[PDB]
UniProtKB/Swiss-Prot annotation:
Key words of the record: Allergen, Antimicrobial, Bacteriolytic enzyme, Disulfide bond, Glycosidase, Hydrolase, Secreted, Signal
Binding site for substrate: N101
Protein name listed in UniProt: Lysozyme C
Tissue: In the egg white and polymorphonuclear leukocytes.
Main subcellular location of this protein, as a coarse class: secreted
A GO molecular-function descriptor: lysozyme activity
Amino acid sequence: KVFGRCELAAAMKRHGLDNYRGYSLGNWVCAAKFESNFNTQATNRNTDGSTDYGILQINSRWWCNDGRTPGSRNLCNIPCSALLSSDITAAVNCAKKIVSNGNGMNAWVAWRNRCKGTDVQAWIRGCRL
């Protein structure tokens, strides 16, 4: 499913991401934009053979199982395909574990390079939250 900016902001909010670990809602929305252009079916394979899945482009090397990443950990205890669903629940739950891991949102390369330090609040502007 390809979410709308404000639609996404509201679902993320309802799922408790707003200010989760100190990261404002706009941060999450910005990351989603640049990681997947708001598409829950987005996939991208890496040179190391792992694959990124979903709206937050969660990695198969640590976070989910896709049956083809040898020596993968499955930290979120879910099949990667669960991260492509229209219901963003597993992705959010999984993102919460990731951001809690020590490097915060720096785990998402597009966030660090394109959101970090910018006016992320612009991402929720005009939305009915």
